Design a protein around this ligand. Structure first.
Ligand SMILES: CC(=O)N[C@@H]1[C@@H](O[C@@H]2O[C@H](CO)[C@H](O)[C@H](O)[C@H]2O)[C@@H](O)[C@@H](CO)O[C@@H]1O
Ligand SMILES: OC[C@H]1O[C@@H](O)[C@H](O)[C@@H](O)[C@H]1O
Ligand SMILES: OC[C@H]1O[C@@H](O)[C@H](O)[C@@H](O)[C@H]1O
Ligand SMILES: OC[C@H]1O[C@@H](O)[C@H](O)[C@@H](O)[C@H]1O
Lengths: 185, 103, 41, 103, 103, 103, 103
């Protein structure tokens, strides 16, 4: 399971369709196409929100790490949440995919391409005056049978989705070269 | 007129109410001759069937048998907790008479 | 332009639309109600 | 024709609108002889039923009764919010005539 | 045969096309005798109904009226955007003849 | 019997396989007299229909026509990819005879 | 009544249990005359069919056939794992007599 610190409340997330990246209103909402790029999302530090720019929403591998981010990020807030997210193919390990050019390495992020649908969220914890309430609230709409056997997308699949700018050397080195989009390399 | 499942279950002979409170573990559906039925079981070890339409059923129950089998398939797929079951216990497995779901 | 990055953008959207369909197949199937065809016809 | 549930409800004697604005708490379905019906309950304690088809119904209601039962099972399993109900208040539990959902 | 809803709508007298391009706001289903129907509305204020089966309907429309009520219910529940509606404007609310959805 | 849509498709005259490998772009449904049918299109510009039941249809096909429209409706909402279509090319739009989905 | 797909299957001649433990890979549906059917295949290579209602079918089996086809459509869409299948192996592809699933 992965975790994300967020000021946005459960009922808001429910109306939105899940933890949405910056700018996207409804999860399925088409028409209003947004820029979806991994490398640009990974370098983008945002205040008021844990990295959720450029068609991706980032998460952390443990409650503690997610909690560390909320601390420095949602520092101002008197009450926020840490959502417990199930692993599925829409998520990519930013470190594994970006490699040497990993914007902020030692932070070990895993980003969900296009957001995190509500049915993929297991539950969440409330955090008051920066202290986690050890009572997880199960999301009644979490698809257990479905997400039970799912896991993160292997880095292989993220390579071409790497978003590196046209040149970036990676496009001319292992293993981004074996996967460079039509115009990269 | 009955307001709940236990009240409804009492209007009949040879019925028992079982508080299940759990989702169905397995669903089995058969179209084989004289065996057109649905069987479900639970983690508890309990097995229940929906009888093959037969001579012990009035014409009004015919459409009701189909609805019950439809309900068991969807409840299974959605992983919905069944609250209680009213069943005729003079059959093996015990025959379903009414279902109840809560929350 | 529509070289390296038009690709990444179009490739990322492709992966996403595929996933979104897997999601709809889950949550929208809960609404599917089956019909008695022999009663319809 | 009526354009709203209230408008439609008022064309009948012995009816009233119940402003629900909430999802169904429990759903009970029965295939027991002469009592093939559905019963739903709300957090408020309000209990309504879909009647066993009898003489009181005209032929065109036959299909509408089955559909209403299909509608209530889906609403329940999906926790879809119900807006108002139009019920014939001359039955126990009050019998359902129309349902409306919103947003 | 028609290749589009506009083209199909044009073969009937008293019909008009409404470009909705929006999800349904509310849904109303009724099993009340003589008012076995469905009514839908949009945030724009539009209200349309699927008519109660009557002498104006040929036998082949009966199964289509039924399919249409099924379609509207699931379209509402899934919050799917409707594109256009072909409606007969000699009824109030306007009566649905055809529907189109675009992804 | 056949084991693939192509095998099945080749047992009839006036047919042909179209490999679509795409979701449906638009869905059209009609309950208009003599036009009770469904029409679908693809971003490839192809348009297909499920014909109105007629005398070119044998009785066993009647239940099948109904099922096909149910399938097309749910396939459309879920944005599920159609793999191939077997269609009679002697109709405009071409008439769907069978469908296949993969993954 | 049988309490298991295996037990039920063994009551028939020319049947055989296949342990699948996987989701359907592809789904084929046909409405072509004399070929109204569904054919499914798994990654493992097995292909199965729900056959055409012929003289080899009893009346109570016509409704059960439709139900099976409904089940196959929904399990394919939801990607639900089939556990076991009881098939009549005296046909090509083998015909489905019953299906089982668990989680
Ligand atoms: C207890 C009993 O034998 N009752 C009779 C009915 O039997 C029950 O019927 C249900 C279906 O309605 C189910 O099969 C039960 O297991 C069965 O015992 C039935 O035969 C009806 C016929 O009018 O009345 C009996 O009294
Ligand atoms: O048509 C159905 C209605 O018929 C009348 C009766 O009083 C109502 O209770 C309801 O049964
Ligand atoms: O076939 C249905 C239609 O029949 C005619 C009438 O003008 C329309 O309003 C509608 O009822
Ligand atoms: O069974 C239906 C088929 O009947 C014949 C005709 O040429 C085809 O176009 C198709 O309609």
């Amino acid at each position: 399971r992965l975790y994300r610190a967020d000021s946005r409340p459960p009922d808001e997330i429910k109306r939105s369709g899940g933890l949405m990246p910056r700018g996207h209103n409804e999860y399925f909402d088409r028409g209003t196409q947004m820029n979806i790029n991994l490398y640009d999302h990974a370098r983008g530090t945002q205040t008021g929100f844990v990295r959720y720019d450029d068609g991706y929403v980032s998460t952390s591998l443990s409650l503690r790490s997610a909690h560390l981010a909320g601390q420095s990020i949602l520092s101002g807030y008197s009450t926020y949440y840490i959502y417990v997210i199930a692993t599925a193919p829409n998520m990519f390990n930013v470190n594994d995919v970006l490699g040497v050019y990993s914007p902020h390495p030692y932070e070990q992020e895993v980003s969900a391409l296009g957001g995190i649908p509500y049915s993929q969220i297991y539950g969440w914890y409330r955090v008051n005056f920066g202290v986690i309430d050890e009572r997880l609230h199960r999301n009644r709409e979490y698809r257990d049978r479905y997400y039970r056997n799912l896991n993160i997308a292997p880095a292989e699949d993220g390579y071409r989705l790497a978003g590196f700018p046209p040149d970036h050397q990676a496009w001319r080195e292992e293993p981004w070269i074996h996967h460079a989009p039509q115009g990269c390399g | 007129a009955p307001q709940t499942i236990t009240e409804l279950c009492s209007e009949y002979r040879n019925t028992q109410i079982y508080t299940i409170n759990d989702k169905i573990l397995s669903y089995t559906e058969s179209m084989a001759g004289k065996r057109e039925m649905v069987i479900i079981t639970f983690k508890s070890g309990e097995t229940f069937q929906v009888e093959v339409p037969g001579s012990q059923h009035i014409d009004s129950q015919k459409k009701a048998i189909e609805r019950m089998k439809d309900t068991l398939r969807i409840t299974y797929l959605t992983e919905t907790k069944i609250d209680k079951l009213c069943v005729w216990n003079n059959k093996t497995p015990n025959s379903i008479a009414a279902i109840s779901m809560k929350n | 332009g529509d070289t390296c990055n038009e690709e990444t953008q179009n490739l990322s959207t492709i992966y996403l639309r595929e996933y979104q369909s897997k999601v709809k197949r889950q949550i929208f199937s809960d609404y599917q109600s089956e019909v008695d065809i022999y009663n319809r016809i």
